[PDB]
Design an enzyme around this catalytic site. Structure first.
Site, PDB file in Angstrom:
ATOM      1  CE1 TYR A  83     -38.517  79.877  29.201  1.00  0.00           C
ATOM      2  CE2 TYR A  83     -38.913  81.149  27.186  1.00  0.00           C
ATOM      3  CZ  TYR A  83     -39.361  80.266  28.160  1.00  0.00           C
ATOM      4  OH  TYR A  83     -40.639  79.761  28.102  1.00  0.00           O
ATOM      5  CG  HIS A 105     -21.225  86.879  35.468  1.00  0.00           C
ATOM      6  ND1 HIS A 105     -21.840  87.670  36.414  1.00  0.00           N
ATOM      7  CD2 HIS A 105     -20.209  87.615  34.964  1.00  0.00           C
ATOM      8  CE1 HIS A 105     -21.205  88.825  36.498  1.00  0.00           C
ATOM      9  NE2 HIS A 105     -20.206  88.814  35.637  1.00  0.00           N
ATOM     10  NE  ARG A 122     -28.702  86.837  36.865  1.00  0.00           N
ATOM     11  CZ  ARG A 122     -29.852  87.149  37.454  1.00  0.00           C
ATOM     12  NH1 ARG A 122     -30.086  86.792  38.731  1.00  0.00           N
ATOM     13  NH2 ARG A 122     -30.757  87.839  36.777  1.00  0.00           N
ATOM     14  CG  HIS A 181     -37.410  91.833  36.123  1.00  0.00           C
ATOM     15  ND1 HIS A 181     -38.477  91.576  35.286  1.00  0.00           N
ATOM     16  CD2 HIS A 181     -37.788  91.381  37.348  1.00  0.00           C
ATOM     17  CE1 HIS A 181     -39.460  91.019  35.976  1.00  0.00           C
ATOM     18  NE2 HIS A 181     -39.070  90.892  37.232  1.00  0.00           N
ATOM     19  NE  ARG A 227     -25.998  90.932  38.338  1.00  0.00           N
ATOM     20  CZ  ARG A 227     -25.309  92.064  38.215  1.00  0.00           C
ATOM     21  NH1 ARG A 227     -25.698  93.150  38.886  1.00  0.00           N
ATOM     22  NH2 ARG A 227     -24.222  92.110  37.440  1.00  0.00           N
TER      23      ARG A 227
END
Ligand SMILES: [Cl-]
Ligand SMILES: [Cl-]
Ligand SMILES: [Cl-]
Ligand SMILES: [Cl-]
Lengths: 221, 225
Positions: B204, B168, B171, B194, B51
């Protein structure tokens, strides 16, 4: 096991050895055996079914227009009323999978040989099986495996080999290509999932270990 | 969750290139520095997936160049410290996403570049308060996220990207990349932490669903005789 599979290049080398044996052969019976084992070895590495399932494939099970194969039984090894040996059981691993173009050639080649022997060889009783011996019966498992081992050894591969290792090889391949455990099982069947899962785990763990290696290749500026 | 939800590598590459190109055209050393640093940050976050707050909190001592690893041990809190430095590193344990990650040669290169630039400033520039931060503005403070986002946005506009952008997406882009490289979710999670796992999860799944659909396409390349 966890490392009980072959690399593509090992399999390629097996198939080339078997095709070589097929070509030197004079007996048409032996030639057909070796020719066909070579086809079967590739086919199974490229599709992942059990040997019993592959032996049960019949002309009607294939759909070349949609490049798909319907897997819907296995061989029972006894004689039918006609003297034919090996009978298809229809009696829930049943599934439809997709065929690559290569797999289609393989099937077409088998079928072509079968049309020809059906027509010209009195001893060949067509019962619509695809992977057959000279009599038109599904090839016997033990024979396929014997030829496969002998090639693998001749080719200097050290691992124990059999049709299982080929099915495992396909599972390993699907893993390396980033297919999910669920999709692999739709394709290869939900039976013996422990083995499937064991290979999936081993392979995906190698991939994780390769992570920094792949990232080494990434530069954006 | 969508293709608008992250950047392709080549889109990131254009952005960086556009930002560097703007930096080269500048007269003010302070502006050129901002742009040069936004470009390094953009690549670094795309290559590493932390982040922005964690990236901004990186200090010289967190980097292990010999083992090519980075220690992610804090995030930036946006208030003044008692000497007037703005942005302080928080290391409190409970908001624990603390992890060590591997760095690629390129990432190391990027860090070495930023640090070298900070050394120049620390030595020559009276107004650079050196607190060991790597991704800094000209006062030695961690760069403010809005000034990064604004430049990132304009770069995306100028280069014709029609996605919504902020730190963001970088990331997310890293997560997308690791997913296309066949990295397990567990491994992704260890690298990227996490936080906002709903998002990590949805990226994913989206990508792994794409890869499943591409299965037959991949198999079509396989021929063994
Ligand atoms: Cl052929
Ligand atoms: Cl036989
Ligand atoms: Cl550079
Ligand atoms: Cl700033």
């Amino acid at each position: 096991q966890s490392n009980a599979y072959l690399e593509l290049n090992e399999i390629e080398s097996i198939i080339k050895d078997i095709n070589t044996k097929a070509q030197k052969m004079h007996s048409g019976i032996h030639k057909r055996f070796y020719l066909f084992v070579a086809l079967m070895t590739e086919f199974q590495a490229l599709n992942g079914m059990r040997i019993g399932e592959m032996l049960a494939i019949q002309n009607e099970d294939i759909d070349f227009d949609n490049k798909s194969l319907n897997i819907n039984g296995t061989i029972h090894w006894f004689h039918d009323e006609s003297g034919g040996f090996g009978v298809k059981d229809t009696t829930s691993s049943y599934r439809t999978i997709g065929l690559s173009s290569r797999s289609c050639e393989i099937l077409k080649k088998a079928i072509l040989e079968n049309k020809k022997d059906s027509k010209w060889n009195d001893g060949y009783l067509n019962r619509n099986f695809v992977f057959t011996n000279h009599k038109g019966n599904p090839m016997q498992t033990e024979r396929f495996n014997k030829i496969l081992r002998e090639a693998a050894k001749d080719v200097g591969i050290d691992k124990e080999v059999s049709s299982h290792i080929l099915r495992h090889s396909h599972i390993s391949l699907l893993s390396q290509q980033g297919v999910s455990l669920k999709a692999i099982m739709d394709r290869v069947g939900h039976s013996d999932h422990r083995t499937t899962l064991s290979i999936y785990s081993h392979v995906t763990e190698q991939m994780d270990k390769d992570m920094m290696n792949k990232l080494e290749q990434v530069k954006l500026g």
